[PDB]
Amino acid sequence: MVHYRTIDSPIGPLTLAGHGSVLTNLRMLEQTYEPSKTHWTPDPGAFSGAVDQLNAYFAGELTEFDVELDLRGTDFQQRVWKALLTIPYGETRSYGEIADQIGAPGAARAVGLANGHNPIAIIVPCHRVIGASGKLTGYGGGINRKRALLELEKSRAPADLTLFD
């Protein structure tokens, strides 16, 4: 089957779901309709690796995840999500840049639609893609969550203070 675990976070309760140690879902699920969850098993100790990295991430002590994923969705979606995974912590891309990278120049709007279906938030960093006008998107408080994640990554202090001496 599929089990799940919900943890606290500065952007609200994050639900992690998947089989065994493999993540299939990561979403701030509250005040949204999510029918699959009814057929999920609660497991308060699942994905302990992932949960540690997420806590480390929010504390500014992590910038790269080592978490096994299983992304399910259409071919075009897989191409988009794979490309999201190449966007480093603290950087952003435009939808037009992602469309070029996946081999579909001009598909900025398709990238935006596919981006909104990302099953694994934060770790697959859909929040790092923004249109030219600079406007964040996402219903259900989604804009505010993205913005939080963005401000968090922009606040990154230099790693080695000894480089200043």
3-state secondary structure 19-66: ECCEEEEEECCCCCCCHHHHHCEECCCCCHHHHHHHHHHHCCCCCCCC
Domain-embedded: residue 88:
yes
Cα separation, 26 vs 14, whole angstroms: 7
Residue 133 and residue 61 share a domain: no
Residue 88 and residue 64 share a domain: no
Nearest to 122 by CA among 44, 31, 11: 11
Element (H, E) at 16: strand 14-19
> How determined?
X-ray
For residues 21 and 53, the answer to whether their CB atoms sit within 8 Å is no
Cα separation, 38 vs 28, whole angstroms: 16
Whole-Å CA distances, 19 to 6, 27, 44, 66: 15, 16, 14, 17
One-letter amino acid of 38: T
Residue 92 and residue 66 share a domain: no
Element (H, E) at 4: strand 3-7
CATH of the domain at 33: 3.30.160.70
By annotation, the residues acting in catalysis are 126
Instruction: Give the domain range for residue 103.
Output: 71-156
